[PDB]
Amino acid sequence: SGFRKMAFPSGKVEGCMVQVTCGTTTLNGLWLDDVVYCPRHVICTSEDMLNPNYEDLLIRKSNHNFLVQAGNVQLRVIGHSMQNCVLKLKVDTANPKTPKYKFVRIQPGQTFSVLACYNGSPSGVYQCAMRPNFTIKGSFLNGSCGSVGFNIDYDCVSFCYMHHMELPTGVHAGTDLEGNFYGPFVDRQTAQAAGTDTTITVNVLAWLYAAVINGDRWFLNRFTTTLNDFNLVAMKYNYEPLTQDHVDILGPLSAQTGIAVLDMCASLKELLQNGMNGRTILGSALLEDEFTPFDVVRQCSGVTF
Amino acid sequence: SGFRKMAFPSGKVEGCMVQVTCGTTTLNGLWLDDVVYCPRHVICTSEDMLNPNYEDLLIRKSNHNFLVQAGNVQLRVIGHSMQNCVLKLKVDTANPKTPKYKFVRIQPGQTFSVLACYNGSPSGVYQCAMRPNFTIKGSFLNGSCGSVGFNIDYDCVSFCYMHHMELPTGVHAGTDLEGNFYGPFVDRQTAQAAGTDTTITVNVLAWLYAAVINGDRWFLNRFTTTLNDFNLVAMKYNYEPLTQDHVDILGPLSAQTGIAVLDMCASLKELLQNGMNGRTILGSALLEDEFTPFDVVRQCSGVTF
């Protein structure tokens, strides 16, 4: 028993990290086969950060401009190329530590592990959610661009995030591995803001099931409610609405515990209206929304990779 | 910016995990060079767990009773011995992925990353503190035995924990890698209680500094206190006494922020006496005690491995 915020094992991703320099600028690259992927803003310098001419900047660059370093080894760049907000540095050597991988685009509300890196070396790993406003609440310092987010299925790494920037509020924004930003953000130092963030309701429910599995049931009551008497108290308080897929994804936890998806939907309604009255759930005095129903199953079942 | 419960990258430890089976009992082992280390209770049946005589149990086993598997490869056992609560199985192949490592015994209050494993394969990674009563609050299921906790210091993996058991209260107990239990516990299914736990005061201070570094400042006040006056208050609330050694260890964070330790102590004093008083700090509504000062420096300075 016990229930923790748990990351995926990071080994497969670690062997793909390299340092990419262009001029005075150093960030991280993802070396898969004979391609190093990284944020395009690596080729900017100084005043470029305001209205950079990416197309123009890339023309002025040689394949010889990009210094790529995998440990002691320097790698030779034989190509360059841009796809949206990502650069691809073709190199003469394919990565022998290249794992089974794919590139995917996650949805708002799903979670993933981040391997935070500096100078092509790993610093640490942590779990986070894509917020409904397309930001993540990460831990990144200058130099961490090119760090990626991932899930694992079996032996296959699904890469889903590459880090590009921090917003003025202190939250984080980035792209998929095809180089498209999550949310309405651009890779320019210009004033940009997120939509007001909402609470991932299906995730809160998942965490309440996790609490029951681990003994915490003080919040269970005799009552029940319906979706749209629940939604009444709810979106009033900037909670997400619950889709069909969401409930179907909660069945395994209601199966596990004997407690209907709609009947827990009611215990949550009441914690929203009234609070926790000083009580805690799984060591938290707030409602936690960064565990998906999949996360709970994985952790509570002992899934391995 | 941002501050997350962050684990060490796990790849160096992932390449050491194997499966160990004896009879119908399977758990995890750690393969370093030509030895596999695992919990000795792998050699028990349930007819033995009342009052196991491990020496006597081990006498009856031969090398061929131990099945060790590293992915698909069977590793042949060519010797066995026991060191305290750890079984050391000599094998006919040295692990080529053995990192630079040492065995360390951590002290209460210190943190480490756990790589939770089942069937010799990794499930997930998360951070734990050794509690003052020598338990940890992890996430482990049946079959997780032999999962290890570790820190990475420069280039070297410091292994500090191997998981052995869950206590009746739902917390977890284990040994160092020389097989000595942390705390008053034994590897037997007998009624076992832990000391009363206490809050790790130095870590709460560390975390308040982390909060200031990341812009959370509402709890700051103009007051300063003395080590004696602080301890008179804090010990009523089941906090560990703060010592000069602890004040010294906070120096880098007091330096970073320009807030003296005894100034921050007056903030903590007020938080204990009046509560969080409806506010949050780094996304929590409780005082967090599982970041050490070194954890904060590591994460805020972007240390790599």
Add this chain to the structure above:
Amino acid sequence: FXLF
């Protein structure tokens, strides 16, 4: 069956 808590010896994991």
Add this chain to the structure above:
Amino acid sequence: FXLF
């Protein structure tokens, strides 16, 4: 100098 927030493009990391």
